[PDB]
From a paper:
Nitrile group was the optimal substitutent on indole, especially, when the nitrile group was introduce into the 6-position of indole (compound 25), the most potent analog was identified, which was nearly 23-fold more potent than compound 19 and >1,000-fold more potent than the fragment hit resulting from virtual screening (compound 4, IC50 > 100 µM). Ligand 25 is situated in a similar position as ligand 19 in the binding pocket of BACE1. The guanidine group again forms critical H-bonding interactions with the two catalytic residues Asp32 and Asp228. The substituted nitrile group forms a new hydrogen bond with Ser328, which may account for the improvement of its binding affinity. This subpocket located at the opposite of flap loop, which is under-explored in previous studies on the discovery of BACE1 inhibitors. The SAR study in the present work further demonstrates its value for future inhibitor design. The superimposition of structures of BACE1 in complex with compounds 19, 25 and the initial docked fragment are also shown.
Residue numbers in the entry: -3 to 157, 170 to 310, 315 to 385
The structure:
Amino acid sequence: GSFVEMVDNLRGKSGQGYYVEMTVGSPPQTLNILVDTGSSNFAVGAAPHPFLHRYYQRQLSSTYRDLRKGVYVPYTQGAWAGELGTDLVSIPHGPNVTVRANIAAITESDKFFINGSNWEGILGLAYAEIARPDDSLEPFFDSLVKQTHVPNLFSLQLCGAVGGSMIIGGIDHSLYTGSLWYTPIRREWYYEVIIVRVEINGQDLKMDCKEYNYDKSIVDSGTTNLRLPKKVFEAAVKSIKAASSTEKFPDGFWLGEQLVCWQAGTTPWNIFPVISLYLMGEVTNQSFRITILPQQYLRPVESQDDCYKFAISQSSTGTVMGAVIMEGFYVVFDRARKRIGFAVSACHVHDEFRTAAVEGPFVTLDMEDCGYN
Ligand SMILES: CC(=O)Nc1c(Cl)cc(CNC(=N)NC(=O)Cn2ccc3ccc(C#N)cc32)cc1Cl
């Protein structure tokens, strides 16, 4: 394939984010940057911190330009503050171009950096609307498209336990099997989609699709869990408990407050159900379903023991399809045609009885009502 040099450009530790090497400034400073499809700022640590091995040094970059403007980015648990500026940016194992991009130099932070994660910055891949301080601040990818020939499209293959590929400018066919199925992007801020139905072990959850998309549903690579709206989570957990009732688990396991460990080799994946999301398709009344295995939603925590954490958690900000979902699939963010594609990942962790799947088409009536306004 012609994108061979971008294959395998992602690394990471489990549950700690996938990162790509970027070089910034001149002479080259190379940094490990978190790949996040749920945000829109390019930001790098620019001061020493206990969790950072290296960081961006602006005074050593002759091409660094100061924007004389501070930036503050709050998240749910953490936050960071820093200074805005521009510099030359490249991705060594990505497309062969260099761009002048906005960089947020992070000079202070709370619970943002992860001990041992080996990354020191974040690459926001979503649209300008959700950028701090405001929309006038062109996100990295927008800058890439404007200044260069690179087609307005990228794709992600995150392989679970860690590594994967971020293909920029195209689609690499060795990364997936079967056909690609596309769902429209509802609005360009987050990568927003519409879930029209949810099944556990082929059994329908029987809720109004409005509930599945309450607030919004997004595809977000810098989040670990599949997060479901309060009511949907409650129902889903009932159904999963019922589907795996040949075994018993403490109530805190389903809330992620407890772990269960099996002896090495013996996890009974067979007792947990497959989970299915149906997404609106590209044609009236047409949908398709993506289906994930326990190997995706039970995550290992790093002896003689294998400990697992349930990785479906409740949300107050709608559905977030994080790495739990994405590690099953090759995902194509086709920004040029306002659509997102899913195909079975050539490298998804599976066993011999069941595999992740993307199947279609299905007929779902009145899908237009499922979105929130
Ligand atoms: C240690 C850690 O969690 N670091 C971290 C942090 Cl603080 C923020 C990010 C930002 N990227 C995200 N894709 N997502 C979030 O931060 C989660 N989050 C971001 C905004 C936000 C708002 C409401 C809720 C709820 N409920 C959750 C929210 C990435 C990482 Cl790795």
